[PDB]
Each structure stands twice: as C-alpha cells, then as structure tokens.
Amino acid sequence: MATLKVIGVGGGGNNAVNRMIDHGMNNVEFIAINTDGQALNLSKAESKIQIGEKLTRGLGAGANPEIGKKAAEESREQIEDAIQGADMVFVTSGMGGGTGTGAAPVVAKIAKEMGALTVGVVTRPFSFEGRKRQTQAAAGVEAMKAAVDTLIVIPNDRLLDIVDKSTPMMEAFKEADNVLRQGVQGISDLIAVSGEVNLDFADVKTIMSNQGSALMGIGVSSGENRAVEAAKKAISSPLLETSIVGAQGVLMNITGGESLSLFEAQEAADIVQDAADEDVNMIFGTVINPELQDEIVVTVIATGF
Numbered sequence: 651m652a653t654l655k656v657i658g659v660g661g662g663g664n665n666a667v668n669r670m671i672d673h674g675m676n677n678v679e680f681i682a683i684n685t686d687g688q689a690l691n692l693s694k695a696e697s698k699i700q701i702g703e704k705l706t707r708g709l710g711a712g713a714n715p716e717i718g719k720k721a722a723e724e725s726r727e728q729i730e731d732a733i734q735g736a737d738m739v740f741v742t743s744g745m746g747g748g749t750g751t752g753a754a755p756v757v758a759k760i761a762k763e764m765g766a767l768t769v770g771v772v773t774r775p776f777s778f779e780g781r782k783r784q785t786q787a788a789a790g791v792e793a794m795k796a797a798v799d800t801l802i803v804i805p806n807d808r809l810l811d812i813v814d815k816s817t818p819m820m821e822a823f824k825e826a827d828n829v830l831r832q833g834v835q836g837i838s839d840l841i842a843v844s845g846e847v848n849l850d851f852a853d854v855k856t857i858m859s860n861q862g863s864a865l866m867g868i869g870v871s872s873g874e875n876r877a878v879e880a881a882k883k884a885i886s887s888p889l890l891e892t893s894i895v896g897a898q899g900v901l902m903n904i905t906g907g908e909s910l911s912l913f914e915a916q917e918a919a920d921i922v923q924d925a926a927d928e929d930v931n932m933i934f935g936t937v938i939n940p941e942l943q944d945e946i947v948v949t950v951i952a953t954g955f
C-alpha cells in the first residue's frame with residue numbers, strides 16, 4: 651500500500667503533529683523537525699530530528715527565517731533518511747517564525763526530489779502578531795508554493811471567526827488541525843478500502859501533482875438531503891484561504907451503506923461541479939460500507955485554480 655508520512659516543522663508544525671497523535675491516527679508515520687530542543691524533547695513523534703544544533707545550540711531560530719533555512723540544509727541527509735520510502739508527504743508548519751518559515755520549504759523540496767507526492771498545510775499568523783510577522787510569513791508561503799506539489803493555507807485570523815469570547819485557545823488550535831487530520835485520514839481511507847467504483851493513489855497523484863493551491867475536505871450527513879448536505883460540508887470550510895471556486899481538477903468519493911442511491915450521488919456531484927464553476931477534471935468514486943445505515947460521507951480533493 652502507499653505509505654503516508656506527516657512532517658511537523660518548527661513549533662506550530664510539531665504542535666499539530668502532537669495533537670494528531672493524541673487523537674490517534676495510524677497507518678501514518680509522524681516525523682518532528684525543529685531547532686528548539688526543549689520543544690522537540692516533548693514531541694510524541696516516533697522520529698525526531700533536531701536541525702541546526704551547531705547554528706543555534708539547541709535553541710530556536712529566534713524568528714530569523716534564514717537560520718531555519720540553513721539549519722535544514724545542513725541536516726539534509728538526516729531529513730532524506732527520515733523521508734525515504736514515503737509515497738506521500740504532508741509538511742505542516744506555522745509560517746512567520748524562524749524555523750517553519752525557513753526550514754519547511756527545504757523539507758518540502760527534499761521530499762519532492764525524492765519522489766514523494768508532497769502536500770504543504772501551513773498557517774499564516776494572526777494580525778495581532780503584527781506586520782512583520784505577516785511579511786515574513788508571506789515570503790514563506792511563496793517559497794512553499796515553489797517547493798510542494800499542492801499547498802493548503804490556513805490564515806490563523808480565520809479562527810477568530812469560529813470562536814466565541816471564551817473558547818480556549820487550545821480548542822481553536824485543534825480546529826485548525828482538523829484540516830490536515832481530515833485530509834490525511836481521507837487519503838488513507840481512499841487507499842485502504844476497495845470501492846465499487848474504485849479510486850486509488852494513482853488518481854490522487856493525477857489530481858495533486860504539480861498543481862498549486864488545493865482544498866481537501868470531508869463532509870458527513872444523515873437523513874433527508876444527506877448527500878447534498880455532506881457535499882456542501884466537504885467544500886465549505888471557513889478556515890481556508892482557497893475556496894473551491896474555480897477548481898480545474900476534483901477527486902471525489904462518496905461512501906454510504908446499501909441504501910446509497912444513484913440519484914443522491916448525482917446530486918452531490920453537481921453541488922461540487924456548480925461550486926467549481928468550471929469545466930473540471932472530475933474523478934468520481936463510490937464505496938458501499940454496509941456498516942453504514944443512515945450515514946453518508948463525501949470526500950473532496952480540489953485543485954487547479
């Protein structure tokens with residue numbers, strides 16, 4: 651089977667990896683990468699890589715992205731060996747600081763040059779962190795786009811749209827982690843289960859390779875109108891920079907029980923074509939899971955904007 655690895659780069663990246671291991675997630679290998687040895691010693695990841703020990707002496711990059719870049723380059727062979735064998739690599743990082751901003755594009759490039767399908771999932775900083783953080787982050791975002799196959803960007807300011815005045819900050823951060831966690835889970839399930847209309851990792855590659863911005867979403871629903879509601883959920887995250895409008899390629903999977911109807915499959919497909927507003931390259935699949943009764947799940951991967 652294809653092997654999927656998730657790499658957290660810098661403090662936010664390593665936080666996401668820890669929170670996803672906590673949630674449980676298997677068939678996925680985790681790798682934590684950082685300059686900061688204090689933070690890295692707390693990582694729950696099976697594979698830990700301290701970069702730039704010489705440059706930083708176990709500290710972080712002190713918000714200098716050039717030091718994160720030089721720290722990754724210096725540790726290229728330890729990064730290659732941790733990646734080796736991966737068919738797909740998800741590189742997650744908070745843009746704007748020193749280590750994620752500088753090192754995450756180098757990790758991505760190493761992954762892509764070793765043959766993995768390479769997906770970045772990165773955050774931009776909150777506005778309240780100031781203009782410079784934001785400018786450094788935008789330079790990181792540009793570097794990541796040049797190095798990955800597909801990029802998903804999560805503006806942290808979007809978390810302010812889904813909290814109330816009391817929502818704990820750690821709960822907000824878990825919501826942003828879901829973008830990555832559901833993407834990865836979605837792909838993992840699409841590879842593992844055999845569908846009636848079967849999708850596989852060759853279809854993932856066709857839709858995601860060398861294709862810029864991406865959306866990855868899962869939607870689940872029941873009852874009346876379940877296929878439309880699940881498909882609208884899959885494509886409508888309030889956390890994303892890139893909405894599905896304009897998508898040129900789509901991978902879409904519908905999973906349901908024995909009651910799944912042809913009519914409802916068509917309805918869900920049309921939701922995604924309409925929101926696309928394009929002459930799309932759609933690869934459609936279907937799985938019948940008899941353990942499902944009233945539930946239907948729609949998975950969507952959209953690219954090509």
Ligand SMILES: Nc1nc2c(ncn2[C@@H]2O[C@H](COP(=O)(O)OP(=O)(O)O)[C@@H](O)[C@H]2O)c(=O)[nH]1
Binds near residue numbers: 750776
């Ligand atoms: N959503 C989220 N954003 C984070 C988290 N950790 C840090 N950030 C954000 O990520 C940016 C970089 O901070 P950090 O990863 O700690 O810097 P680094 O260790 O030098 O790479 C910050 O400016 C914050 O916007 C987190 O756990 N979740």
Ligand code: BEF
Binds near residue numbers: 660661685712713
């Ligand atoms: F904390 Be990051 F390395 F600047």
Ligand SMILES: [K+]
Binds near residue numbers: 840841843844849850
């Ligand atoms: K499959």
Ligand SMILES: [Mn+2]
Binds near residue numbers: 661710711
């Ligand atoms: Mn740090």
